[PDB]
């Protein structure tokens, strides 16, 4: 701008983050526990013990 | 009394295990000393017989 003259921006932008699209993750061993949180499983174990 | 001792110690051990898994450190610290006392009491048999925690012959002693 010190040596030329600009116009008002015709397109405003900024820095941003590019990532690879999340894919269907390869199922993990012990993915059969995913429907319930770990805390539920531990409470189940200790309720079994207590009962 | 002999038939009734193991449940107490093992249930207290269950308490200790539960508080370990839940990561409740303070209560586990408060409970470890009694755990070790029970362990020592059960596995020492200070009585010379060393066959039962309470022995009818050794029992009836005032001490």
Curated annotation (Swiss-Prot), chain A:
Domain of life per record: Eukaryota
Q: What else is known?
A: The postsynaptic actions of L-glutamate are mediated by a variety of receptors that are named according to their selective agonists. This receptor binds AMPA (quisqualate) > L-glutamate > kainate.
> Quaternary arrangement and interactors, per the entry?
Homotetramer or heterotetramer of pore-forming glutamate receptor subunits. Tetramers may be formed by the dimerization of dimers. May interact with MPP4. Forms a ternary complex with GRIP1 and CSPG4. Interacts with ATAD1 in an ATP-dependent manner. ATAD1-catalyzed ATP hydrolysis disrupts binding to ATAD1 and to GRIP1 and leads to AMPAR complex disassembly. Interacts with GRIP2. Interacts with GRIP1. Interacts with NSF via its C-terminus. Interacts with CACNG2, PICK1 and GRIP2. Interacts with GRIA1 and SYNDIG1. Part of a complex containing GRIA2, NSF and NAPA and/or NAPB.
What is the UniProt domain comment for this protein? The M4 transmembrane segment mediates tetramerization and is required for cell surface expression.
Q: Where in the cell is it found?
A: Cell membrane; Postsynaptic cell membrane; Postsynaptic density membrane
Expression induction or repression: Down-regulated in the pyramidal cell layer of CA1 in the hippocampus by global ischemia.
Protein's UniProt name: Glutamate receptor 2
Family, similarity comment: Belongs to the glutamate-gated ion channel (TC 1.A.10.1) family. GRIA2 subfamily.
Tissues expressing the protein:
Detected in forebrain. Detected in dendrites of neuronal cells. Expressed in the pyramidal cell layers of CA1 and CA3 and in the granule cell layer of the dentate gyrus.
Q: How is it modified after translation?
A: Palmitoylated. Depalmitoylated upon L-glutamate stimulation.
Described function: Ionotropic glutamate receptor that functions as a ligand-gated cation channel, gated by L-glutamate and glutamatergic agonists such as alpha-amino-3-hydroxy-5-methyl-4-isoxazolepropionic acid (AMPA), quisqualic acid, and kainic acid. L-glutamate acts as an excitatory neurotransmitter at many synapses in the central nervous system and plays an important role in fast excitatory synaptic transmission.
Q: Which residues cross the membrane?
A: 38-51
Curated annotation (Swiss-Prot), chain B:
Protein family: Belongs to the cornichon family.
Q: Source species, please?
A: Rattus norvegicus (Rat)
Report TM segments.
10-30
- Topology feature Cytoplasmic, residues: 31-63
Give the top-rank taxon of the lineage listed in the UniProt record for this protein: Eukaryota
Subunit info? Acts as an auxiliary subunit for AMPA-selective glutamate receptors (AMPARs). Found in a complex with GRIA1, GRIA2, GRIA3, GRIA4, CNIH3, CACNG2, CACNG3, CACNG4, CACNG5, CACNG7 and CACNG8 Interacts with CACGN8. Interacts with GRIA1. Found in a complex with GRIA1, GRIA2, GRIA3, GRIA4, DLG4 and CACNG8.
Q: Which residues of the full protein are shown?
A: 64 to 126 of 160
Output this protein's name: Protein cornichon homolog 2
Localization, per the record, is: Endoplasmic reticulum membrane; Postsynaptic cell membrane; Cell projection, Dendrite; Cell projection, Dendritic spine
């Amino acid at each position: 701008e010190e040596v030329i003259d600009f116009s008002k921006p015709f397109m405003s932008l900024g820095i941003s983050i590019m990532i690879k699209k999340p894919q269907k993750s390869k199922p993990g061993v012990f993915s059969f526990l995913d429907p319930l949180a770990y805390e539920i499983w531990m409470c189940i174990v200790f309720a079994y013990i207590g009962v | 009394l002999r038939k009734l001792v193991v449940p107490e110690y093992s249930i207290h051990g269950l308490f200790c295990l539960m508080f370990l898994c839940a990561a409740e450190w303070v209560t586990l610290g408060l409970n470890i000393p009694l755990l070790f006392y029970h362990l020592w009491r059960y596995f020492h048999r200070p009585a010379d017989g060393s066959e039962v925690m309470y022995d009818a012959v050794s029992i009836m002693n005032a001490d």
